C-alpha cells in the first residue's frame, strides 16, 4: 500500500481513458467506495461501444447490487479477480488497494476494447 503510487497510477489510467468527470480525491484517499463506483461505472457504460455492448447484454444494475455485478462481470468477461473481496470493497479502508482495483478494471476495459475492435 503506497497511496502516492496508486494515485499516480490512477491519474495515468484516467488520462488514457479520457475520463471527463471530476474525481472525488478525498473519497479515494479514505477508501470510500462512493469515489470508485462512478469511475468504474463510466468505463462500463461510456468508454467503448464494444465493451458496453458486451456488458449490457448480460446483467442490469443503490449500488449494493452494483458491486456484485461488477465482480461477476470482471470474472466472466475480463478474467479479472479483484484483490479485495466484495465486502472488503464495500467497507471503508484498504484505500490504496481500491484505487489500484479501479486502475485494473479500467485497464481491462481498454484492453478489451482494443481486442474487440480488432476482430471487427
Amino acid at each position: 500500500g503506497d497511496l502516492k503510487r496508486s494515485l499516480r497510477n490512477l491519474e495515468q489510467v484516467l488520462r488514457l481513458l479520457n475520463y471527463p468527470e471530476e474525481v472525488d480525491c478525498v473519497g479515494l484517499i479514505k477508501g470510500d467506495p462512493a469515489a470508485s463506483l462512478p469511475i468504474i461505472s463510466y468505463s462500463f457504460t461510456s468508454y467503448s461501444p464494444y465493451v458496453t455492448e458486451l456488458i449490457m447484454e448480460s446483467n442490469v444494475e443503490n449500488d449494493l447490487r452494483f458491486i456484485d455485478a461488477v465482480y461477476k462481470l470482471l470474472r466472466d468477461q475480463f478474467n479479472y479477480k479483484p484483490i479485495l473481496t466484495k465486502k472488503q470493497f464495500i467497507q471503508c479502508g484498504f484505500a490504496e488497494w481500491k484505487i489500484q482495483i479501479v486502475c485494473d478494471i479500467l485497464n481491462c476495459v481498454m484492453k478489451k476494447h482494443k481486442e474487440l475492435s480488432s476482430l471487427q
Side-chain angles (χ1 to χ4, degrees):
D2 195 71
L3 178 58
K4 185 182 177 179
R5 164 96 63 167
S6 306
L7 286 166
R8 184 185 179 176
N9 292 345
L10 180 58
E11 171 182 40
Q12 186 62 56
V13 166
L14 289 178
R15 210 141 50 204
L16 287 185
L17 184 124
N18 288 336
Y19 184 74
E21 278 295 332
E22 280 208 13
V23 173
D24 182 9
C25 202
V26 179
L28 296 175
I29 292 167
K30 296 186 170 183
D32 183 17
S36 284
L37 300 191
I39 303 174
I40 299 165
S41 184
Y42 175 85
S43 75
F44 287 172
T45 67
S46 317
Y47 173 63
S48 174
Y50 300 132
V51 177
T52 294
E53 181 180 1
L54 173 68
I55 287 168
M56 296 308 152
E57 197 175 345
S58 294
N59 189 279
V60 179
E61 278 59 56
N62 296 332
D63 294 342
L64 290 184
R65 299 177 179 177
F66 199 101
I67 294 178
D68 302 323
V70 167
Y71 270 68
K72 182 177 178 181
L73 288 173
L74 296 168
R75 187 186 60 88
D76 306 330
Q77 325 290 346
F78 304 89
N79 297 329
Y80 177 77
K81 296 179 179 179
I83 296 84
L84 311 179
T85 56
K86 298 176 180 186
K87 290 184 181 177
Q88 283 181 334
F89 201 92
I90 187 52
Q91 73 174 3
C92 284
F94 300 111
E96 306 86 350
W97 306 91
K98 289 175 187 174
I99 294 168
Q100 198 55 38
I101 284 179
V102 165
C103 303
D104 292 358
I105 297 173
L106 270 61
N107 280 313
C108 295
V109 171
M110 295 184 293
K111 301 305 177 177
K112 177 63 65 174
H113 162 77
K114 174 163 186 172
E115 141 197 355
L116 294 185
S117 67
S118 169
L119 55 90
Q120 294 300 323

